[PDB]
Design a protein around this ligand. Structure first.
Ligand SMILES: Cc1cc2nc3c(=O)[nH]c(=O)nc-3n(C[C@H](O)[C@H](O)[C@H](O)COP(=O)(O)OP(=O)(O)OC[C@H]3O[C@@H](n4cnc5c(N)ncnc54)[C@H](O)[C@@H]3O)c2cc1C
Ligand SMILES: Cc1cc2nc3c(=O)[nH]c(=O)nc-3n(C[C@H](O)[C@H](O)[C@H](O)COP(=O)(O)OP(=O)(O)OC[C@H]3O[C@@H](n4cnc5c(N)ncnc54)[C@H](O)[C@@H]3O)c2cc1C
Ligand SMILES: NCCc1ccc(O)c(O)c1
Ligand SMILES: NCCc1ccc(O)c(O)c1
Ligand SMILES: [Zn+2]
Ligand SMILES: [Zn+2]
Lengths: 230, 230
């Protein structure tokens, strides 16, 4: 049995280091015989804002608009904007979801943050109760492939930016694990802009290389100890 | 000599708890004689996406688009889109910047992440020469006023969501502190949707009561130790 992979990509320039990491993922997974799909957010001019335009049906409460309540209800009724449902179908069938993006303020670019806000709604990605290990997307794997401006050294406990794992918390635990995803070790390609030609090729080669045996990997213990140690 | 306050508000509903917190801040700071300005992102339909449209005229390299460089260059060349510059002016004149928003996936809603991504560009909020304690916005104060779905109990080091200080790291340290901001202790209104009307009032009152002496408050030590340590 093969596998389906969804790459949610967030970069404006195809020739970027991110674009290369993305194309590398596509080529390698495609070579393995895997089914691959890419959601190129910027090329899709993907809507990041969570507004009442995401609901098409009669609102549960037209007097006071509550995004969470309205999208939860719209999901069950099937009155969500189609751009949201198109993404949910991709995630639903996916066995692995890779996020390829440059770090923006210790997080994901707003266009990708919007994807997370609008696509992972209650009813589809999780339920109350029905989160974390009970998240609705349980059984699926997720992986963050991040590029940075800061060097590995800066991203250390005693470094100026602190350990890289610190900023992964909101994404891996607060979002992915919350929805039931098993999180694979993140792929951080440190400061490609500062790196030399050979170092950049090595970073890219390491990515595709790791992808060759990605199906053999085990997820990380997405806990506070893993991220912070303490 | 009077103070200037900018409130970056991120909520779709005026009758919301977030809306009330913002209105209470405007009322209290206005009563004190403070100069107050509010950036209602949703009402402004603020653009969250970082694209080449953020640069006016012609790009310094229309071959390969590098947002960071193009915006840095555009800033120094006074060629940024007006929505961006309108915000920077409010920021530059402000003595205190309050962010009022509901917690979305352990972070800010995408529309607000976009504000941070696009408004705090290189040359304005920071530069290789000066960052963090030497950020270009040094001297100014920043304060996060966030509302959550989860309860205070859930937000403890041994709780399901972990300690709230954990998700503050990317925002307070990675973003605000990085730009020279002195960070005031966050204002977190835990689960207002769960709490009772009396408890909700208590929360809003603590906020307004706190605003009475915010100018007397001392900045928190934005350190890895403060967020993660004991
Ligand atoms: C709003 C904003 C916020 C930011 N916040 C943060 C933050 O909080 N923390 C942080 O650390 N950084 C931050 N950054 C910096 C950001 O993370 C980096 O600029 C980004 O990750 C670099 O990745 P890239 O793909 O854009 O690089 P590129 O500039 O595209 O790549 C660098 C070089 O790679 C070359 N290249 C491309 N493909 C290949 C290939 N296959 N082989 C060899 N070379 C190749 C390119 O041609 C180029 O010369 C921020 C940037 C912005 C704009
Ligand atoms: C996409 C998305 C992602 C999310 N991610 C997270 C997450 O990672 N972690 C987390 O903990 N939560 C998360 N949440 C939940 C979110 O943080 C809460 O729903 C939100 O903070 C509630 O604030 P509110 O202003 O919307 O509440 P409201 O529903 O507007 O307020 C609750 C009650 O307050 C009443 N009220 C209004 N004004 C007043 C007043 N002046 N005095 C007294 N009562 C008043 C209202 O009328 C209402 O009945 C997420 C929600 C969404 C939609
Ligand atoms: N319908 C939004 C309610 C909600 C509460 C907690 C979360 O972690 C989350 O992603 C969403
Ligand atoms: N010119 C972007 C480089 C950069 C590096 C680290 C940051 O924290 C940041 O905001 C921006
Ligand atoms: Zn976790
Ligand atoms: Zn700090």
């Amino acid at each position: 049995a093969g596998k389906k992979v969804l790459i949610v990509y967030a970069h404006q320039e195809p020739k970027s280091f991110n674009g290369s990491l993305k194309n590398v993922a596509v080529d390698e997974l495609s070579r393995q015989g895997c089914t691959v799909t890419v959601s190129d957010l910027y090329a899709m001019n993907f809507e990041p804002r969570a507004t009442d335009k995401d609901i098409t049906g009669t609102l549960s409460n037209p007097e006071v608009f509550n995004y969470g309540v309205e999208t939860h209800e719209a999901y069950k009724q099937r009155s969500l904007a189609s751009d949201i449902t198109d993404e949910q179908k991709k995630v639903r069938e996916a066995d692995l979801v890779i996020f390829q993006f440059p770090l923006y303020w210790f997080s994901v670019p707003a266009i990708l943050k919007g994807w997370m806000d609008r696509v992972l709604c209650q009813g589809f990605a999780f339920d109350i109760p029905g989160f974390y290990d009970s998240g609705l997307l349980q059984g699926k794997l997720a992986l963050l492939s991040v590029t940075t401006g800061g060097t590995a050294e800066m991203y250390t406990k005693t470094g100026v930016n602190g350990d890289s794992r610190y900023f992964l918390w909101p994404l891996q635990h607060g979002t992915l694990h919350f929805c039931g995803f098993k999180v694979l070790a993140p792929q951080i390609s440190f400061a490609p802009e500062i790196a030399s030609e050979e170092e950049r090729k090595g970073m890219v080669a390491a990515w595709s290389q790791r992808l060759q045996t990605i199906w053999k990997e085990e997820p990380i213990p997405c806990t506070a100890h893993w991220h912070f140690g303490q």
